[PDB]
Structures are given as C-alpha cells and as structure tokens.
C-alpha cells in the first residue's frame, strides 16, 4: 500500500514510456531516448546526446514545497567504471535535474551517486556516496553495471536519508534548509559528462508524497523480487538456452575451464586462478568474459521449461557449449566414487537451481541429487579448484561460515555493453 502515496512512476508499458502511477503526468520523451531490455521487461536508456532526454512538467501532486515530505526511488544501471570515465574524474554530472536557482538533483561523480538539495538562500545539503570498487563492487558500488535500487527520503525540517538495495547508506540533517520548490521541470538527461560513451538505464523512477521510514524502504525494495525467477549477475531474469559465463562467488575473476584427465575417461571442469585487470594502478577489476581464452561457456537447459525464465527449484542441466553435448554431472559411482564433477554426455543424477537466501540475491545455489553423493555444488578448497558435490554443505547449510556460503553461490554472466574488458 506504498501505492497510496505514489504520485509519479516513470517506466515502460506496451512499448511506450509513461507515468505508470495512474496520474497521467505529462512527459516529453525526446527521440534520442531508447527502450531496451531491462531487469523486468523493458527499461529506459539515456545516451550522451542532446536528443536523449525526458522533461516532466511538475504539477500540484509532484511538489517539493517546504511543507511536503517526499521519497524518490529508482532502479539504475550505470556502466562499470572504465578508462573513458576518467575524463570526468572529480566532475559531478547530472542524471536527473530539478535545480534552477534552488531545488534538487541526482548526479554521478567518480563512480558514486550524488543527491543534492539547495534552498532559496543558497543553503546546500548533499549526500555523496563514498563506495570503493574493492570493498563494495558486488553488493553496492554504483559504476558496476549491476542493477541498483536507490531510495532517497526527505523529511523536511528533519533529515534526508539515502538507501541502496533497501539498506540505509547515509543521512543528513536538513533542519537548516528552507524551501527547494521551483517552477522548473524535472529533466532526465546526462548533462556535464565529457565521456560521451556514457549511457544509463533507468526504471521505476518513483516519487511518493511521504518520507518512507527505514522499514518501508526495505519493504519497497523487497516488492521488486516477489516472483520465483532466479537472476543473472547483473540482476536481470536468469534464462534458459542463453550463453553464460559461470562464476563462483569466492573467485569472481576465476574462469571456468575444463581438463581431460587421460587416466580416467573424464573431462573435469575447474575454476582457474583469479584474473584481473587494472583500470588505474589503485583499482583491480575481475575479468568476467576472458576473451581470447579457453573459458567454458554454458547454457542452462530444461526440456520441461514453461517459458524462457529459470525459476527457483527448476530441474535443469548445465550444458558446456564448447563441447556441444556434454553436461555437468557426476561420474558413475562404480568407476569413480568421489564427489568431483565431470563433463559427460550421460546424465547421472539431477541438478536443481535453488535460492536458499532471499529472492533479491543475484546468485543461486545448485543442488546435486544423486544416489550416493547428494550435495551443494561447490569448489574443492592454488592453481585452480575442481567442482564437487558437498554433502556437508548441504546438510549444514544453515550454519555455514561466510567462506563456505561464498563457495556455494554461483553467478551466470552474459556480455553487456556496460561492462567492457
């Protein structure tokens, strides 16, 4: 029932950009704006050209007057920090702007997000997130090419609070601030960036006529993961029959490879040592695609699929595309009794893709069902790490330490324009 206070919601419906709130707010979408594939059907894409903007005239409901609390929320996907972005080092640039002499704006700066309010006396309050790639890449860093949910709550006279993925990040006292209302439109547009390769994907940009509390923001975030679909690394629905790189959470830059062990009759998949590149001397980025290497591409296959989407608890095979006809399985127990996985034409047991955490996680776990070697797919403990079915992790899942939890989480990654290497 957060819908009760929703006065504006920018998204795509039936091939068109609209206000989805029902309020029928008047938008001007210029011809440079695109509609692309998103985290939940289609999303807006803004490019670095003059025709790529959306202008929204404000009305009474969309009001930032001194006597009105409000919340702004949105899904954003910002390309992973790259060398082209360094031309904008230390320079804030606009994404969403309702600033004339006074007002508010949402900006990007040094891979981070800026919220700024300025009142009619020139009083300024901003939140500048201070995330670093090394420490926050996976869960919160903005310039990651991963879908992030942003919430900003404004209780005028009290505080301004910023959230990523339903978690409070920062807050400021705004008791000193007076009015930020103005008569200018809200402009959705990249403005001020010298890196003209920059582009942003933006979805469910919502304005609410109340300041949501911390519990309400968590609930809002959770409401975007109400289905049983699994997710890819970027936060988009996981699909069948789609080429992926498969990655273990414990070694993000470790490429999935395979090796024929002549002794046995078997090909063994393994995670190789972490590969990284430098964007600067101070920032190491993991390779995900490993172009110009023997990295194993995979597809998730299920002849009983109902649509293209992978759902929690589906039984499915992981097919190794390099080989054409081999799947991830265990070897015949009589031959090899150990829990190491091999690549075999012969299906030996069942794989189930599951989510033992919450629906919002962009990884999954993989449950092996086999007569003698039931377990969760993990990496064994180096040069590389073999895949194996862990009975111990399965039976003790709820109590596992962080490292073991990490080794049982799997990501699927597809190439995207917003992640270049």
Author numbering: 834 to 1214, 1221 to 1260
Please share excerpts from the published article on this structure.
Here we analyze by comparative genomics Pb mosquitocidal and non-mosquitocidal strains and show that the active component in Pbm responsible for Anopheles toxicity is a complex that contains a clostridial neurotoxin (CNT) that has high selectivity to anopheline mosquitoes, acquired through a megaplasmid. This locus encodes a protein, which we named paraclostridial mosquitocidal protein 1 (PMP1), with high similarity to CNTs, a group that includes the tetanus neurotoxin (TeNT) and botulinum neurotoxins (BoNTs). PMP1’s closest relative is BoNT/X from C. botulinum strain 111 (36% identity), followed by BoNT/En, the Enterococcus BoNT-like protein7,9 (34% identity). PMP1 presents the conserved SxWY motif in the binding domain (HC), which in BoNTs is involved in ganglioside receptor binding (Supplemenatry Fig. 1C), as well as the conserved disulfide bond that links the toxin heavy and light chains, and is essential for toxicity. PMP1 is thus the first CNT that targets invertebrates.
To analyze if the SxWY motif is involved in toxicity and to determine the presence of other cell recognition regions, recombinant PMP1 HC was crystallized (residues 825–1260) and its structure determined at 1.95 Å resolution. PMP1 HC includes two subdomains, a N-terminal lectin-like fold (HCN) consisting primarily of 15 β-strands arranged in a jelly-roll fold and a C-terminal β-trefoil fold mostly composed of seven pairs of β-strands linked by loops (HCC). One striking feature of PMP1 HCC is its general hydrophobicity, with an array of a dozen aromatic residues exposed on its surface and its lack of clear binding pockets. Of particular interest are the three extended loops found almost in parallel in the HCC subdomain. A fourth loop composed of residues 1213–1222 (loop 4) was disordered, but seems to occupy a different position compared to the equivalent loops in BoNT/B and TeNT that are more protuberant. Remarkably, W1231A and W1224A mutations of the tandem SxWY motifs did not decrease toxicity. Instead, a similar motif, SWYG, located in loop 1 of the HC C terminus is critical, with an important role for the tryptophan in this loop. In addition, the mutant affecting a surface-exposed tyrosine hydrophobic patch (Y1100D/Y1101D/Y1173A/Y1227A) also nearly abolished toxicity.
